[PDB]
Design a protein around this motif. Structure first.
Motif, PDB file in Angstrom:
ATOM      1  N   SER A  38       0.825  -1.205   0.000  1.00 48.70           N
ATOM      2  CA  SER A  38       0.000   0.000   0.000  1.00 48.70           C
ATOM      3  C   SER A  38       0.861   1.256   0.000  1.00 48.70           C
ATOM      4  CB  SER A  38      -0.943  -0.006   1.202  1.00 48.70           C
ATOM      5  OG  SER A  38      -0.222   0.074   2.416  1.00 48.70           O
ATOM      6  N   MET A  39       2.115   1.134   0.431  1.00 44.94           N
ATOM      7  CA  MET A  39       3.029   2.265   0.399  1.00 44.94           C
ATOM      8  C   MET A  39       3.519   2.534  -1.019  1.00 44.94           C
ATOM      9  SD  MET A  39       5.140   1.424   3.882  1.00 44.94           S
ATOM     10  CE  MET A  39       6.232   2.839   3.810  1.00 44.94           C
ATOM     11  N   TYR A  40       3.990   1.495  -1.718  1.00 45.61           N
ATOM     12  CA  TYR A  40       4.591   1.713  -3.035  1.00 45.61           C
ATOM     13  C   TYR A  40       3.539   2.022  -4.091  1.00 45.61           C
ATOM     14  CZ  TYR A  40       9.106  -0.050  -1.364  1.00 45.61           C
ATOM     15  OH  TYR A  40      10.293  -0.219  -0.691  1.00 45.61           O
ATOM     16  N   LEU A  41       2.369   1.394  -3.987  1.00 46.71           N
ATOM     17  CA  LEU A  41       1.433   1.411  -5.104  1.00 46.71           C
ATOM     18  C   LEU A  41       0.665   2.723  -5.190  1.00 46.71           C
ATOM     19  CD1 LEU A  41       0.524  -0.452  -7.279  1.00 46.71           C
ATOM     20  CD2 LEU A  41      -1.360  -1.197  -5.845  1.00 46.71           C
ATOM     21  N   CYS A  42       0.383   3.358  -4.054  1.00 50.05           N
ATOM     22  CA  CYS A  42      -0.267   4.662  -4.092  1.00 50.05           C
ATOM     23  C   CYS A  42       0.702   5.806  -4.343  1.00 50.05           C
ATOM     24  CB  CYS A  42      -1.047   4.922  -2.804  1.00 50.05           C
ATOM     25  SG  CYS A  42      -2.657   4.105  -2.767  1.00 50.05           S
ATOM     26  N   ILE A  43       1.998   5.606  -4.118  1.00 50.69           N
ATOM     27  CA  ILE A  43       2.974   6.578  -4.600  1.00 50.69           C
ATOM     28  C   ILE A  43       3.061   6.519  -6.120  1.00 50.69           C
ATOM     29  CG2 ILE A  43       5.400   7.213  -4.548  1.00 50.69           C
ATOM     30  CD1 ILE A  43       5.499   6.309  -1.677  1.00 50.69           C
ATOM     31  N   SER A  55       0.661   5.762  -8.008  1.00 55.39           N
ATOM     32  CA  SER A  55      -0.558   6.339  -8.557  1.00 55.39           C
ATOM     33  C   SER A  55      -0.541   7.861  -8.533  1.00 55.39           C
ATOM     34  CB  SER A  55      -1.783   5.833  -7.798  1.00 55.39           C
ATOM     35  OG  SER A  55      -1.809   6.351  -6.485  1.00 55.39           O
ATOM     36  N   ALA A  56       0.457   8.470  -7.890  1.00 56.86           N
ATOM     37  CA  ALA A  56       0.515   9.926  -7.815  1.00 56.86           C
ATOM     38  C   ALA A  56       1.335  10.525  -8.952  1.00 56.86           C
ATOM     39  CB  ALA A  56       1.088  10.356  -6.466  1.00 56.86           C
ATOM     40  N   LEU A  57       2.385   9.833  -9.381  1.00 56.06           N
ATOM     41  CA  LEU A  57       3.312  10.328 -10.389  1.00 56.06           C
ATOM     42  C   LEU A  57       3.058   9.750 -11.774  1.00 56.06           C
ATOM     43  CD1 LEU A  57       5.691   7.721 -10.536  1.00 56.06           C
ATOM     44  CD2 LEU A  57       5.987   8.686  -8.271  1.00 56.06           C
ATOM     45  N   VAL A  58       1.814   9.391 -12.076  1.00 56.28           N
ATOM     46  CA  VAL A  58       1.422   8.713 -13.313  1.00 56.28           C
ATOM     47  C   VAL A  58       1.695   9.592 -14.530  1.00 56.28           C
ATOM     48  CG1 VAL A  58      -0.485   7.626 -14.530  1.00 56.28           C
ATOM     49  CG2 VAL A  58      -0.303   7.408 -12.089  1.00 56.28           C
ATOM     50  N   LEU A  95      -1.177   7.597 -20.119  1.00 59.10           N
ATOM     51  CA  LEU A  95      -2.612   7.390 -19.962  1.00 59.10           C
ATOM     52  C   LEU A  95      -3.357   7.683 -21.254  1.00 59.10           C
ATOM     53  CD1 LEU A  95      -3.453   8.845 -16.438  1.00 59.10           C
ATOM     54  CD2 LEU A  95      -3.401   6.458 -17.165  1.00 59.10           C
ATOM     55  N   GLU A 102     -11.893   6.066 -14.415  1.00 57.10           N
ATOM     56  CA  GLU A 102     -10.913   6.945 -13.790  1.00 57.10           C
ATOM     57  C   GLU A 102      -9.992   7.572 -14.829  1.00 57.10           C
ATOM     58  OE1 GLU A 102      -8.221   5.004 -11.244  1.00 57.10           O
ATOM     59  OE2 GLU A 102      -7.681   6.836 -10.155  1.00 57.10           O
ATOM     60  N   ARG A 115       8.953  12.659 -14.337  1.00 55.67           N
ATOM     61  CA  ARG A 115       8.064  11.650 -13.769  1.00 55.67           C
ATOM     62  C   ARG A 115       8.555  10.240 -14.065  1.00 55.67           C
ATOM     63  NH1 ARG A 115       1.948  13.913 -14.990  1.00 55.67           N
ATOM     64  NH2 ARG A 115       2.106  15.810 -13.713  1.00 55.67           N
ATOM     65  N   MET A 150       9.142   6.995 -11.753  1.00 60.68           N
ATOM     66  CA  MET A 150       8.507   5.719 -12.087  1.00 60.68           C
ATOM     67  C   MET A 150       9.542   4.613 -12.263  1.00 60.68           C
ATOM     68  SD  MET A 150       5.647   4.074 -12.738  1.00 60.68           S
ATOM     69  CE  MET A 150       4.376   5.274 -13.123  1.00 60.68           C
ATOM     70  N   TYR A 182      11.305   3.686  -8.602  1.00 63.53           N
ATOM     71  CA  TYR A 182      10.528   2.964  -7.598  1.00 63.53           C
ATOM     72  C   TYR A 182      10.261   1.527  -8.021  1.00 63.53           C
ATOM     73  CZ  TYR A 182       9.885   7.182  -4.896  1.00 63.53           C
ATOM     74  OH  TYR A 182      10.100   8.292  -4.120  1.00 63.53           O
ATOM     75  N   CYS A 207      -4.791   0.534  -6.132  1.00 67.12           N
ATOM     76  CA  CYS A 207      -4.356   0.902  -4.790  1.00 67.12           C
ATOM     77  C   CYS A 207      -5.502   1.370  -3.899  1.00 67.12           C
ATOM     78  CB  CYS A 207      -3.276   1.984  -4.867  1.00 67.12           C
ATOM     79  SG  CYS A 207      -2.295   2.203  -3.358  1.00 67.12           S
ATOM     80  N   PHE A 236       0.634   8.177   3.721  1.00 66.18           N
ATOM     81  CA  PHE A 236       0.567   8.104   2.265  1.00 66.18           C
ATOM     82  C   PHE A 236      -0.845   8.242   1.704  1.00 66.18           C
ATOM     83  CE2 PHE A 236       4.760   5.564   1.978  1.00 66.18           C
ATOM     84  CZ  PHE A 236       5.459   6.745   2.071  1.00 66.18           C
TER      85      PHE A 236
END
Lengths: 33, 83, 78, 294, 300
Positions: free
Chosen positions: D197-202, D204-207, D212, D237, D254, D258, D261, E217, E236
């Motif tokens: 949950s730490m790595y995956l939502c980070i 999702s911020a720098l996409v 996309l 989304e 970015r 990406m 990480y 996530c 986070f």
């Protein structure tokens, strides 16, 4: 006790207000005032 | 030195014919500039091997900007102990 | 402990350093600021060698007999 | 040069029953605790962490497996077990007797995993000494990952239940298998999920916005063999994030982050020590390989 | 005590023209599919996996290089080549002949990457045997983790401009990608936009993540509420964008979501390792006039 460790998630100080002793000191202080 | 310290080869650009820059972990504590209470022992010792921290900061002018974008861990190649 | 454990163990050591920094980025979110730390591998030490304390000038200094060096990459933990 | 040999003292004569299973697995890899010649039997098993009355946690068992040294059997005498040792980096013969059988070849890659399919098959109990012995499983690296991929998904979807065909079955070309989950301690398998949950939502911020916009141009008409996950419909989304205009030097900062990480996701999806096999004989079931360091 | 030598024999003699190109690079690092001393031609390049008739790959090459054994040329005699064997942690010498010319310095970490540039820079065609040997792209690691990145960004905006013209400016795209700055110096790479089919697979994977990661996530945060939550995950929640948190997860069903989450992790470990771990080696000494760098190889 470090500057970088300031916002610890479990810091060493814990608030503990004993609500029975707090109501008796309010009520006497509202009696005199 | 105590003849067995650990080393680092910092590298920015070949400007001279052969001049190299080496960083002991007491020296890299001086370029850091953290508070004294994080390392309460070496701050006295690393403060007498060097100046106030501008004797080594003159060689790397980008120490403000190398910390922001985060390229400093890409420029260190760990070497090992002294001989 | 092997590389699969210590990356989770280093996160528990630097818990407060992660927390005190990332209070700032509720206001300003710079993608350049998100990189936090790195871990290299300085080579192996054989088992049960006692690190012997010393004293220099004071400065206490450990020592590792039979050290061998084997450098590794820098991997970005967070 | 260097010798490698571990001979195991044992306090009771083994029965003919339990010796027949040990004679069956004469080439096998089991971890053990200390580095000496003489050794008690209570270190030979993997079952110091995985016993019957203790609820096993296969992540912690796999976490256990990278610490220990690994060893290969030579003979099974009716009193003393005799083993040989594996040190990085040394070439050695290895022979697969492992019961959920897969096929290897020359130039293949391996890993060592805890038993995740049949514990009763892959563990033999010793009623003469009272201590049981647990055998790990050697797996090629593709299924070495793909079983751990399913077990991380499983502890996600057992907590939401606070059915089985999607969560407990590891897929592979030609075969499907059943994971052994009746009693699992999730708490060491959830700290791995706590870091996910730490790595995956980070991430999702720098996409990247252009990457996309690539899928909005792709999955609507351009259908490809490996994009059948989305089934032809964009997620709701992805239309929301692409309202901004594209610019190159935004994504240059970015995509390096990406990149940096995904260097970290090695550390959370690690296997045990790996085994790069260079020569494998087919009909003899022997092999040759060098043990990698941790 | 141990002897190592790799001697490759051929069926036909070499031409006089092709000998000068192999004498051009008398020091190099070739990949080699077998460990034995006597061997046929078909393994010592990248022609065993990458070819003109087959579609050009990145990842199946990068799967191959970590599995493959490296070797170094010593002497080219017609027709029998003489390679030298690479050992785990062995000291030997490398001359650096690779097109285009990137500058090597000492105390850098050499990272073997597959060639994604033009053909005539990378390969030397052997007309006598009809087989192509391919020399790998040896690049220092910090460049090799950056020379891939700006090209992989460039391949994405090439796919956007071919689908819609108004979204990408070429002058904005060319000036920011094909110019690579490292060590204070610059390098203007060959774009080869004459028609980059090498990096199409990585352009598929990183995008399929980029839609499924923020879908992924959200469910993984809400499923992990505990009294024993790890305390860093409270921080986070401020990092994830606010638009990400507004997904209605009722729209995708439970049989869809198990397929997504298994697709979620299975790309991650297949994509992390192919950026991370290949045959990678160190160099402790360099001289620009001799062009010879003493090296040592660290496996894994």
């Amino acid at each position: 006790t470090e500057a970088g460790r300031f916002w610890a998630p479990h810091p060493e100080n814990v608030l503990f207000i004993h609500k029975p002793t707090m109501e008796e000191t309010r009520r006497v202080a509202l009696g005199l005032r | 030195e105590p003849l067995g310290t650990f080393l680092f080869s910092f590298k920015q650009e070949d400007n001279g014919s052969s001049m190299d820059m080496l960083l002991t972990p007491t020296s890299l504590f001086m370029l850091s500039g953290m508070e004294a209470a994080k390392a309460p022992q070496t701050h006295k010792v690393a403060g007498v091997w060097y100046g106030s921290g501008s004797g080594l900061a003159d060689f790397i002018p980008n120490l403000s900007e190398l910390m922001d974008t985060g390229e400093f861990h890409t420029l260190l190649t760990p070497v090992g102990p002294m001989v | 402990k092997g590389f699969a454990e210590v990356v989770a163990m280093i996160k528990d050591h630097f818990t407060d350093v992660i927390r005190t920094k990332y209070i700032q980025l509720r206001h300003e979110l710079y993608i350049n600021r998100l990189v936090f730390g790195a871990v290299c591998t300085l080579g192996t030490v054989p088992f049960d060698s006692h690190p012997v304390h010393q004293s220099l000038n004071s400065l206490p200094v450990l020592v590792f007999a039979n050290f061998e060096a084997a450098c590794g990459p820098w991997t970005v933990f967070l | 040069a260097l010798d490698k040999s571990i001979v195991v003292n044992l306090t009771s004569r083994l029965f003919a029953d339990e010796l027949a299973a040990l004679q069956s697995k004469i080439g096998s890899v089991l971890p053990l605790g200390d580095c000496h010649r003489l050794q008690n039997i209570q270190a030979l098993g993997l079952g110091c962490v995985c016993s019957r009355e203790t609820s096993p946690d296969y992540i912690q068992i796999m976490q256990y497996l990278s610490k220990c040294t690994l060893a290969v059997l030579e003979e099974v005498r009716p009193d003393s077990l005799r083993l040989t040792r594996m040190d990085p980096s040394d070439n050695l013969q290895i022979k697969n007797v492992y019961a959920p059988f897969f096929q290897w070849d020359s130039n293949t890659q391996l890993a060592v995993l805890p038993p995740l399919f049949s514990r009763k098959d892959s563990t033999i109990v010793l009623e003469s000494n009272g201590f049981d012995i647990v055998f790990p499983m050697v797996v090629p690296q593709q299924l070495g990952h793909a079983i751990l991929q399913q077990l991380l998904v499983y502890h996600i979807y057992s907590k939401i239940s606070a059915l089985d065909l999607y969560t407990t079955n590891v897929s592979f070309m030609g075969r499907t298998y059943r994971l052994d989950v009746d009693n699992t301690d999730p708490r060491t398998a959830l700290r791995v999920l706590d870091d996910l949950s730490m790595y995956l939502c980070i991430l999702s911020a720098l996409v990247p916005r252009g990457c996309l916009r690539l899928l909005t141009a792709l999955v609507r008409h351009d259908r490809h063999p490996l994009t059948e996950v989305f089934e032809g419909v964009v997620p709701d989304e992805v239309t929301r994030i692409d309202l901004d205009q594209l610019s190159v030097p935004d994504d240059i900062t970015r995509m390096r982050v990406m990149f940096s990480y995904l260097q970290s996701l090695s550390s959370i999806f690690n296997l045990g020590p790996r085994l790069h096999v260079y020569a494998y004989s087919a009909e003899t079931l022997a092999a040759s390989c060098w043990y990698s360091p941790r």
